[PDB]
Amino acid sequence: XXXXXK
Amino acid sequence: HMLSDEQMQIINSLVEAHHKTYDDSYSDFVRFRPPVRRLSMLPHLADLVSYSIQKVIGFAKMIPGFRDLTAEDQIALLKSSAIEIIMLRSNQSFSLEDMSWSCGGPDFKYCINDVTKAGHTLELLEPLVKFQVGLKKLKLHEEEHVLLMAICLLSPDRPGVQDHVRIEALQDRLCDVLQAYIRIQHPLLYAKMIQKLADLRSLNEEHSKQYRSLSFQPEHSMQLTPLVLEVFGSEV
Numbered sequence A: 001x002x003x004x005x006k
Numbered sequence B: 001h002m003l004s005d006e007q008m009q010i011i012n013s014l015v016e017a018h019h020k021t022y023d024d025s026y027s028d029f030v031r032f033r034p035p036v037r038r039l040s041m042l043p044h045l046a047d048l049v050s051y052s053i054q055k056v057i058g059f060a061k062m063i064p065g066f067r068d069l070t071a072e073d074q075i076a077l078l079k080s081s082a083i084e085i086i087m088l089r090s091n092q093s094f095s096l097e098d099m100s101w102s103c104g105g106p107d108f109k110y111c112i113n114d115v116t117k118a119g120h121t122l123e124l125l126e127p128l129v130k131f132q133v134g135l136k137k138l139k140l141h142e143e144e145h146v147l148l149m150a151i152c153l154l155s156p157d158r159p160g161v162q163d164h165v166r167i168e169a170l171q172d173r174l175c176d177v178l179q180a181y182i183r184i185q186h187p188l189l190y191a192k193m194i195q196k197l198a199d200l201r202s203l204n205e206e207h208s209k210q211y212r213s214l215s216f217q218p219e220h221s222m223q224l225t226p227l228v229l230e231v232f233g234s235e236v
């Protein structure tokens, strides 16, 4: 399951 | 005709960020799924791109001012430009002598026929090679190469961007930095590099077309990676 922005 | 201390630190930050996220040894390539020469090259090239997306993300987070944008804007900029940064950063491994990407030995030498075996056609690949050749002939300095990548990443004209004014300000700072660098170091060049950003928009458009058809075939989409499905996928 874009949290690589924790 | 002079670089300020703040402009100098921006150049130093972008070059060091690139060195952190680009390995000239290409030694992480052995951990990819092996290349095979239907769509036999798709596993390897999907791992290659997914690896590069991770590196582009790392490079983007070290662009001065990038981490001050909202997280949703950071993601929108990444999704829309990731394939353009990858094509841009791939120029370092491209070679004019044999017209291919050489990342080590023969196993990791990617010719145009190899990418054909990843589901892509000549409509994407012939202009992509031409883009690589025209970019290689420019003989960009490393400072210019990394500034062009940061400028491309901070384009405000992308789907899903909200704070279009702040991104415009950040990109203008980098364009100013780049214009002053070219002035000092060279006797035209700025316009050509800006033209390369227009070429990337066209390459981006053709790739998303061929990727979308590729991603809707289950035998092929199951060969991609989770990161590739997110970045190049349609859901937002």
Ligand SMILES: C=C1/C(=C\C=C2/CCC[C@]3(C)[C@@H]([C@H](C)CCCC(C)(C)O)CC[C@@H]23)C[C@@H](O)C[C@@H]1O
Pocket (backbone or CB within 6 Å): B042, B045, B046, B048, B049, B052, B086, B087, B089, B090, B091, B092, B093, B094, B101, B103, B110, B115, B118, B119, B120, B207, B211, B228
């Ligand atoms: C990655 C990088 C390199 C090569 C880039 C290539 C060569 C092979 C074919 C590629 C990967 C193009 C493909 C059309 C992309 C297809 C991806 C997919 C199958 C998912 O639609 C895009 C860039 C081309 C190697 C190294 O320079 C690191 C860089 O970072």
